[PDB]
Amino acid sequence: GKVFGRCELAAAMKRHGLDNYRGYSLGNWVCAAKFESNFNTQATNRNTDGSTDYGILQINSRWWCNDGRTPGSRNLCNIPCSALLSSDITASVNCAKKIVSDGNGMNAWVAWRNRCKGTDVQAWIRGCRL
């Protein structure tokens, strides 16, 4: 287990190279995590299409990680989906980078597109010690 705080997650994401990764400032990543998972590292969402969204950034099992249950699996991050349910954000950050590297913007995250895009995302790191 673990539920992150806002500033604590920002610091961890910064340590892991996400600030301005492919032109997306740190607050975008924190905002995405807030609305995807509420900062809960063990968040899962089981979909009716046979796929599941895993962890703090709700990465989906059809394209990105292998859970052995999902039709059409591509496993483009080359990881078991269970690695995305850690208390350590390593695997989630590595896979998030790969998603963007593999031709996606942050629009890959529905919560980013609907709740973060266009907003003052710097608010999510304001006040934090980075």
List Cβ neighbours of 5 (8 Å cut-off, separation of 6 or more).
39
For the chain, the distance separating the N- and C-terminal CA atoms, rounded to the nearest angstrom, is 24
53 in active site: yes
Q: Which of 63, 43, 50, 58 is nearest to 2 (CA)?
A: 43
Q: Which residues are annotated as a binding site?
A: 102
- Identify the CA nearest to 29 among candidates 129, 91, 122, 126: 122
Interaxial angle between packed helices 26-37 and 6-15, expressed in degrees from 0 to 180 and rounded to the nearest 10: 130
Resolution in A: 1.1
Is 18 inside a domain boundary?
A: yes
Which residue range forms the structural domain that includes residue 74? 6-124
Annotation marks residue 8 as catalytic: no
Q: List the alpha helices (DSSP H) in 1-130.
A: 6-15, 26-37, 90-101, 110-115
CATH of the domain at 40: 1.10.530.10
Look at residue 1 and tell me if it is in a domain: no
- Length reported for the chain: 130
Is 130 a domain residue?
no
**Quick check: is 63 in a domain?**
yes
Question: Does residue 117 contact residue 25 with C-beta atoms inside 8 Å?
Answer: no
Which residues are documented as binding site for substrate?
102
This entry's atomic model was obtained through X-ray
Report the number of distinct structural domains present in the chain.
1
